[PDB]
């Protein structure tokens, strides 16, 4: 994904009006890319003990690739949704 | 100088003039002397002094400036404490 700042300034047109645009408003200047960004980490609840990377029942911050192409498809983990979190807590308590 | 604009069909102002000059209500045009913020070392003090004064434009120049602007820049403006306010109106003329 590319974020593209618009050079040349759209001249500001009303509440309920489209602002017509010019072939110089078509000129852009890319401010940032979503790529070339600090890689973030995703939260997952583990349904199974995995190696040293996760303890069963616990909520861990994983590398996103690992989450998306291994853990989630293989039923080894689930998203940090508030829904199932409660359930997991309950399970822990029971244990 | 756009005697008729595209959308409104009114005359436009050449904004260079507006940037550079001050129209007194009497229709004198006041200008900062050129070459006044430049190469001041080589210039003799008297010359510097001369260059730091404001100046009144020639009749022809004034006329040109009037043509170049719209009637808005020629209105009476009642500023609170503009330093030039006293020069707008003219006193004790005789031909």
């Amino acid at each position: 994904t590319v974020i593209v700042e618009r050079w040349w300034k759209v001249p500001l047109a009303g509440e309920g009006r489209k602002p017509r645009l010019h072939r110089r408003h078509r000129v852009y200047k890319l401010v940032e890319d979503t790529k070339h960004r600090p890689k973030e980490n995703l939260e997952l609840i583990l349904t199974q003990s995995v190696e040293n990377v996760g303890v069963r029942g616990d909520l861990v911050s994983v590398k996103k690739s690992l989450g998306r192409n291994r853990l989630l498809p293989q039923g080894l983990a689930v998203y940090a949704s508030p829904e199932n979190k409660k359930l997991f807590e309950e399970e822990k308590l029971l244990r | 100088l756009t005697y008729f604009s595209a959308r409104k069909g009114k005359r436009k102002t050449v904004k260079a003039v507006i940037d550079r000059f001050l129209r007194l209500h009497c229709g004198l045009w006041v200008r900062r002397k050129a070459g006044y913020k430049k190469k001041l070392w080589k210039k003799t003090p008297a010359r510097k002094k001369r260059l730091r004064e404001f100046v009144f434009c020639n009749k022809t120049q004034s006329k040109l400036l009037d043509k170049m602007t719209t009637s808005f820049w020629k209105r009476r403006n009642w500023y609170v404490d503009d330093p030039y306010q006293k020069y707008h109106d003219r006193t004790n003329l005789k031909v």
Partner: protein
């Protein structure tokens, strides 16, 4: 001469006029909505007023979206809100340097997605942005449901959504027997959403498709006039008997 209504309104008029009027009220509403989609390729001016530089003065600040271009590859599989950007660049980002045209493409992929409501694995063209969105909404199904039609950005996605809605409505067996409890559980996950069965049929359709559907619905065979005549005769006879 002059036209009665302007040319931008002709399409609207057309809807009123014929077969498009026979389409239901809840469907045409969707067509008419056309809201502002989620910003993807530009940072928005979140506040309506900013106070600019150069002069210490507040002024209004509207945010005009970058037009975007979706090539027909993107209709086949879920891309995000993002599609191809078509624009121009100044050469070394000085305006006094040359202006030259530019096409900015999204980074495409090909990935599988299991959908609980559908019980099937869909290979999808999926941008990173889409993946991120999915993660945010947790389930792919959830994302499909949650994502507003303008936001979703694909015909395929829309279709999927429609299917999901239908499933929710009917309460049809996706897991077949030996998993009724499981099915119930799944359903309970998505008690939110779940529109009436008649509305969910029309969801995520083009105009032409909708029209076709409508036609199919009210095609039939023409009824014999003879039958009608006979009925009338019978009625008359009955009336006579009564009197």
């Amino acid at each position: 001469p002059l036209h009665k209504y302007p040319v931008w309104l002709w399409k609207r008029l057309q809807l009123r006029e014929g077969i498009c009027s026979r389409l239901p009220g809840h469907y045409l509403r969707s067509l008419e909505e056309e809201r502002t989609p989620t910003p993807v390729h530009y940072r928005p001016h979140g506040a309506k007023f900013k106070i600019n530089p150069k002069n210490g003065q507040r002024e209004r600040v509207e945010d005009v979206p970058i037009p975007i271009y979706f090539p027909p590859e993107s209709q086949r599989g879920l891309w995000g809100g993002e599609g191809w950007i078509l624009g121009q660049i100044y050469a070394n980002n000085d305006k006094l340097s040359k202006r030259l045209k530019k096409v900015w493409k999204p980074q495409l992929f090909e990935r599988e997605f299991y959908s609980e409501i559908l019980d099937k694995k869909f290979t999808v063209t999926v941008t990173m942005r889409t993946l991120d969105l999915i993660d945010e909404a947790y389930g792919l199904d959830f994302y499909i449901l949650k994502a507003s039609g303008e936001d979703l950005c694909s015909k395929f996605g829309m279709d999927l959504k429609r299917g999901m809605l239908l499933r929710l409505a009917r309460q049809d067996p996706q897991l077949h027997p030996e998993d009724p409890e499981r099915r119930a559980a799944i359903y309970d996950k998505y008690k939110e959403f779940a529109i009436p069965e008649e509305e969910a049929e029309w969801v995520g359709l083009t105009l032409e498709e909708a029209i076709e559907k409508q036609r199919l619905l009210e095609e039939k065979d023409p009824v014999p006039l003879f039958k009608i005549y006979v009925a009338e005769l019978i009625q008359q006879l009955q009336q006579q008997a009564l009197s």
